[PDB]
Design a protein around this ligand. Structure first.
Ligand SMILES: COC(=O)c1cccc(NS(C)(=O)=O)c1
Ligand SMILES: COC(=O)c1cccc(NS(C)(=O)=O)c1
Lengths: 304, 304
């Protein structure tokens, strides 16, 4: 029993973290096989960052300008290319600790673990979600760029995020491992405002199911609703619309608890309209939206 | 910027987790040097668990009755002893991945990371605190016993917790790595009620400092207080008393933010008396008490 905000074990990713230095800029890289992936803004002075022309800045850089250190040993860079907003540094040595891995671009609402690193050295691990506005709410200081976000399916690490940017509002933007930003963000020190940070409805429902499974039942009400009725309320409260695809995904949590998805929707509706009245659910005084349905299944069934 | 509930990187501990089986009971062990540490209740049938006599149950067990598996390879048990509520299984092979490590008994209020394991296989990592009633609020299913709690000081893992028990209320009890229970709990399936789960005052203050550092300032008030005045309010709200030792520990957070510890105490006092009024601090609608002052320093300074 008990339900915790849980990150994947970080060991497989710890073994992939290196320090990348270009001139006076040091950040983190991800070493998979004989390639080190890092944010292309490693090539920038903070001055460059105001209006960088990355192709033009890259002409001034050779293989030997990229200093890659894995622990306290230098890797030989034998090639480099720009893919979108990441640099791929070819090194002469395959990472001996390369895990099975995939590159996956996640959708808003999906959760992942971040291994926060400074100078290629891991400091901590935490669980994030891709927000509906394609930001993440991270914990990232100067030097944390190139820290990555990941999921693990048994023995295979799916890399979904690399850290690039803090917005003036202190929320975070970054790329998939093909260098493509999530959302409309760019690796430039310019005014970039995030859209509405809406609540991930399907995730709140999953967590309400988790609460029922763990004995927190006080919010279960006598009502049901429809998707259209629920969605009118959702809109009003800046919750993402719920689709039949979301209802389908929640099906196993419905089955386990014998609470129809639309019944839990009506319980959520009442919680939005009435508030918590100073009560908690799973030790939270707000509705948690950074557990996916699968996260709830995983933690409530003990997958390794 | 940003402030997250952050666990230590789990890699060093992942490398120490093994499966221990005695008869039909499988749980987790911790392999350090040539010793596997596990809960002594590995020897119990659930029937035994109602009134176990551990010395008497152990007479029926030999070295070969303890099956230790590290990944998919069996370790040879050449010795076994009971220390308090843990078994120490001597194996013929030193763990090649043994990190630098210490055994530390923590005080209530101290935080640590838990690597949740099933069948010697890590499923996730989360951040806990030793509650003032010597429980922890974990996420632990059947098979998770022998999962451990730890801190890392640079390269040295300090092991502070091993999981043993879920109380009828679904909170958790376990031991230090010398087999001594935290609090008055015993490894017996009997009625064991926890005391008052009080709020770790010094931890809430630290997190309020973290909030100021990250731009959440709305709760800063025009008041100050004294330890005695604050403590009258603390008592009323089931907050732990604040000592001059706690004030001393908060000193660096005071210095960084220029907010006197007693001023932040007066801000906390008003938050207890007035509530949050539907506002959040660092994305929480309650006062978070599972960050230590050092945790705040660590995350706000980027230690690795
Ligand atoms: C077991 O049913 C699920 O929760 C489930 C099924 C299939 C896929 C997922 N992935 S998710 C939570 O990101 O959308 C969850
Ligand atoms: C830097 O000042 C601190 O926060 C500090 C100093 C010394 C020790 C600690 N350990 S603790 C938070 O567990 O009580 C924190």
């Amino acid at each position: 029993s008990g339900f915790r905000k849980m990150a994947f074990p970080s060991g497989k990713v710890e073994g992939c973290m290196v320090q990348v230095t270009c001139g006076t800029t040091t950040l983190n890289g991800l070493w998979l096989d004989d390639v080190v992936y890092c944010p292309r803004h490693v090539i920038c002075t903070s001055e460059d960052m105001l209006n960088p022309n990355y192709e033009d800045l890259l002409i001034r850089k050779s293989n030997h300008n990229f200093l890659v250190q894995a622990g306290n040993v230098q890797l030989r860079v034998i090639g480099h290319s720009m893919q979108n907003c990441v640099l791929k540094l070819k090194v002469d040595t395959a990472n001996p600790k390369t895990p099975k891995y995939k590159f996956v671009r996640i959708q808003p609402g999906q959760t992942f673990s971040v291994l926060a690193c400074y100078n290629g050295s891991p400091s901590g691990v935490y669980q994030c979600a891709m927000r509906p506005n394609f930001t993440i709410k991270g914990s990232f200081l100067n030097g944390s760029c190139g820290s990555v976000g990941f999921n693990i399916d048994y023995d295979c690490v799916s890399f979904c995020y690399m850290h690039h940017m803090e917005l003036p509002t202190g929320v975070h933007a970054g790329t998939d491992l093909e260098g493509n930003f999530y959302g409309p963000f760019v690796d430039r020190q310019t005014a970039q405002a995030a859209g509405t940070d809406t609540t991930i409805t399907v995730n709140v429902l999953a967590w309400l199911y988790a609460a029922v499974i763990n004995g927190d039942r006080w919010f279960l009400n006598r009502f049901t609703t429809t998707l259209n009725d629920f969605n009118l309320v959702a809109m009003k409260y800046n919750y993402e619309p719920l689709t039949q695809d979301h209802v389908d995904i929640l099906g196993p949590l419905s089955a386990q608890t014998g609470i129809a998805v639309l019944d839990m929707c009506a319980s959520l509706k009442e919680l939005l309209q009435n508030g918590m009245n100073g009560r908690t659910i799973l030790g939270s005084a707000l509705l948690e939206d950074e557990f996916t349905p699968f996260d709830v299944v995983r933690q409530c069934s003990g997958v390794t």
